[PDB]
Each structure stands twice: as C-alpha cells, then as structure tokens.
Amino acid sequence: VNSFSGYLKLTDNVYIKNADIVEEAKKVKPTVVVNAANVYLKHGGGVAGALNKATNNAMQVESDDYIATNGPLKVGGSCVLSGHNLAKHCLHVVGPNVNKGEDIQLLKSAYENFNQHEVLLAPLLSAGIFGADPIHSLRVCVDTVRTNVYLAVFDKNLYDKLVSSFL
C-alpha cells in the first residue's frame, strides 16, 4: 500500500492521473520521481523545466556536475541523481525527441530503465514537446514496465484522450 491517490488503474502495475508531477511529488515524496531528461541534462521545459524550477535550480546545478564528470547520457539511457525536495531520488530518463529527429524506436529502451525501481512517479515519456504519439508511448509503457508506475499527465485534454483510447 502507498499514498498515491486518485489514480485510475490501467493494468496490474500501471496507474494514471491528470496531475502536475511536481505537486504529486511534493505530496507523496516518492522514492523515485522520473524526469523526462535530455542527454545533456539541460532542464529547460516540459517536465524537466518544471521539476528543476521546483528545486530552485538545485537539480540543474547537480546535473551540470554530473555531465562535467561523466559526459552526456545516451538516448534511451538514464542516471540516478538526487530528488532534492521532491523525492528521495530522481531517475533522469532520456526518451527520443521526435522534434530532434530521434528514433521513436528507442522509447522501449527508455522505459526499460523504470524496471530497476520497484515504484516510480513518472511522466509519459516522449509526449508533449518531445513530439511522439502519446497513445503509442502509453502502450509502450504498459508493455515494457513491470514495476509499479504512477503516471502523472499534465494536459487535461490529453489525459482524457489517453484514458478513452486505452486498450
């Protein structure tokens, strides 16, 4: 039992809510919040810009040190950093950005990173300004992630569309 509230059950292990991931994180303080990162951990907009803003830019400062030491992530890859005031840990996951021309095929690899964590609060990878088909991303999520994932979808119209079209 956990303290995630008001989520619609999609499958055995995947739940979904129309919510701001920042506010969900502030309430639940999950062990892991997922960031929809890019390979440089430059947290500008969407999920990443919002999470980073909520940390007062501490996420960005930490991320810049990570990149200076380790170099960029891979598309489809991830790293574990602090969750700051939002969660114990932040799992920065790089889904493909279709608006950068990146291969949507890498989305499954991106979701596989979630399987290293028993429970996660996460956005829908590659959706929104990452330019992928969100119905497809939700399908890949449910068909790839085996651990317990609580999805926070920001856009109300998108949430309604995702629920109404989910198989």
Ligand SMILES: O=C(O)C[C@@H](NC(=O)c1ncnc2[nH]ccc12)c1ccccc1F
């Ligand atoms: O609408 C959506 O769910 C899709 C969108 N999600 C969010 O940006 C988002 N999601 C939850 N909480 C949030 N709080 C502030 C922003 C935010 C999205 C997902 C992945 C990458 C980019 C992107 F734009």
